[PDB]
Design a binder for this molecule. Structure first.
Ligand code: NA
Ligand code: NA
Ligand code: NA
Lengths: 175, 175, 175
């Protein structure tokens, strides 16, 4: 199965959904889904001594402006390997601009992680969590001479709305 | 190739067989094969501070009561990544009951691991190995309020018999 | 997609090419591509207390004497997981004989690794790098009672030529 096209989004979508992990928490390797083959590829090694603050990936059968599936940061107890998928719930939305282009990130938790599965909204997290996440996106491409503007975090409902828009766009795209 | 259906069991089956690893030795992540897609998914993060004592997975083209392929714990020098497969020999059988349902585990070694490949039966292992394995299955779901009864370990021939029954059942299932 | 047949070699071939990683830097597990299924398998655990000095893999849609795709060692800042691919440039060739049979290795860098991407030829590397690599291949099968002769390293152009010969051979093979 191709992890973008062939993996279902999950019965609970847009609220609860499968996430295919591309990058493990703690990684300095920016892996990404290769859209054509469905394999995981090295996009680059990060240009700064920074690491992903959480497991990171995309939602199957979704589609955004940048012509990729929608991006998700998944907060949980443990690192998850690239190419594996998990079930997550959206708890917040982080709007950002990358080189003048819209690139929002979904903040999620894994609903099968007994520590984090009860979380419904980013306001419940230690405020520091959010601070670190924001800083990561402001920093991670700085040494590439690329500009990344991150805006104020938004509530779980803003993220569910984004996930829905992305499901609709994928559906129109499939022909 | 789908790792359950498309990977051969191996010429030496039931004695020697391919094992597709789902969980790496030392992991607190309970990954499993997603039957529909053939991808590896996060079933859950374990509810206790316990880790898998050995690499863990399933045998291709086999089928048991729980409608999964037969489970295998593979004892060897090194951790093996989820989604990769290896060649193993069955050396013992661990019968257990999980929530009133039969769920036996095969104890195996990797025949391509120069340290362990000579082993033919679990009686050769340090007795502690077996003690730890048993305890792991008695403990690992305890914090989920689920009951796991493990019985006395059985010899290599009992495991080969189980593997055979599971090959037969898979064959009847494929239609 | 099957990582040998279905992944493109890359527009820049023979100079720049996709590499599918089989073994991570630091590993004592000799994983290899299973040609039939496209899955990653444990060929063996190394018989010595040695580890791969760099990420290691093969080039898609190529073919050599041993009927495998051409082998590549990729020098970079970070470990890369088996089954993922990256873009590399060939910077040198290491000729060797394994049990009386030709088995040359390509020395490459990852062109998406900001530290190493500028390298064009092995003469630029610390001489020790090359010394360690050579020794690894002379040592890694010694405890299997197998003989491995490694010869003097050769320049980037010798490696590009090898990659080209291997692309031609693959093309003739596909029927
Ligand atoms: Na994106
Ligand atoms: Na089972
Ligand atoms: Na080779």
């Amino acid at each position: 199965a191709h992890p973008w096209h062939d993996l279902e989004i999950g019965p609970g979508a847009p609220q609860i959904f499968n996430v295919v992990v591309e990058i493990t928490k703690g990684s300095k390797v920016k892996y990404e889904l290769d859209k054509k083959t469905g394999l995981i590829k090295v996009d680059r090694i990060l240009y700064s001594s920074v690491v992903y603050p959480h497991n990171y990936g995309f939602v199957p059968r979704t589609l955004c402006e940048d012509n990729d599936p929608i991006d998700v940061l998944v907060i949980m107890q443990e690192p998850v390997l690239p190419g594996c998928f998990l079930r997550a719930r959206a708890i917040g939305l982080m709007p950002m601009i990358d080189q003048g282009e819209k690139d929002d990130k979904i903040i999620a938790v894994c609903v099968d992680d007994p520590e984090y599965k009860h979380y419904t909204d980013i306001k419940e997290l230690p405020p520091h969590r959010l601070s670190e996440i924001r800083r990561f996106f402001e920093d991670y491409k700085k040494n590439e001479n690329k500009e990344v503007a991150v805006n104020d975090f938004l509530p779980s409902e803003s993220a569910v709305e984004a996930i829905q828009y992305s499901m609709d766009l994928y559906a129109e795209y499939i022909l």
